[PDB]
Amino acid sequence: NRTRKPFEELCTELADLDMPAENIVLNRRVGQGAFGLVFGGEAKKSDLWEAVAVKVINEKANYEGKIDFLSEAKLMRSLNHPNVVRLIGISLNPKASLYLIMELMLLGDLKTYLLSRRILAQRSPNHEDIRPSTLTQMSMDIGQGLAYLHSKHLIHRDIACRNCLVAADRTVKIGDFGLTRQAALPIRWMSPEAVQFGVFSIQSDIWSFGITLYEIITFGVFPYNGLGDVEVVERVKRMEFSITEFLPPQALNTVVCELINHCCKHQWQHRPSSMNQVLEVLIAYPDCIRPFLTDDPPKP
Ligand SMILES: Nc1ncnc2c1ncn2[C@@H]1O[C@H](COP(=O)(O)OP(=O)(O)O)[C@@H](O)[C@H]1O
């Protein structure tokens, strides 16, 4: 064998993180993740219990899949930040599958969050969940969490409202690192220098961050809604219609419209050199993130 040894040498380094299956119990079906279902329950860190969600993949798939499964956890262990989801352990060979244990975010992801609290914005626009005081702090938490990733020479390459989870504290954190690589497909969240060229940088992550901001101020619309995935690879290269054109007419004079337009510029020499240029903006204008909606909900 030549691919069945990679698994058993990898778990040697991740051996201090193994937990017996008698310390993990499954209660809920939290959601349908990318590769398998995620379950919700409680895990005991040999001392006390904590509410936890688990990513699970059965032991029937190829070893090629199990290596990527454990590589997500190995990368996740190198992180510690109040705006990044932190794992607490793994579990090797429990009965039918392999377990990935990561803390529970009570209020789910951000896209389903906004999609469910849409009419609440049209009827109660000053609510503790969805007011510019909270939306700006949320986008700010995502920003400094991505700045923490970039600080330690990491590129996420997949910034969207699907990979940002919110907890009962209503603080948001970075969620999915399935596509995260080292420092030097979601095409709608990718700058053109990363689409036709396959090169990723901090500026490509800033492009996806600006797309996330458009996704937030619209409460979850599908970027470039109405254009197929084949029409967008040709339209974004020749600088026609930045994402700002897809906004309601209530924008195009605001501070958030310009911001996502500077974060999403074809000339990456004009894009911010670091996430801290964007973060320092979110302090001079603390009510920039506003809900800009229509009377017709978005159609996925
Ligand atoms: N720790 C968690 N807390 C709450 N929900 C989660 C958690 N982990 C995963 N999920 C749910 O499972 C899916 C995320 O799994 P993943 O494969 O990481 O997909 P994504 O690309 O959305 O991050 C989402 O639907 C999300 O709502």
Author numbering: 943 to 1126, 1142 to 1257
What does the paper say about this structure?
Schistosoma mansoni Venus Kinase Receptors 1 and 2 (SmVKR1 and SmVKR2) are important for parasite growth and egg production, and are potential targets for combating schistosomiasis. VKRs consist of an extracellular Venus Flytrap Module (VFTM) linked via a transmembrane helix to a kinase domain. VKR proteins form homo- and heterodimers, a key requirement for VKR activation. The intracellular kinase domain of VKRs shares 41% sequence identity with that of insulin receptors (IRs).
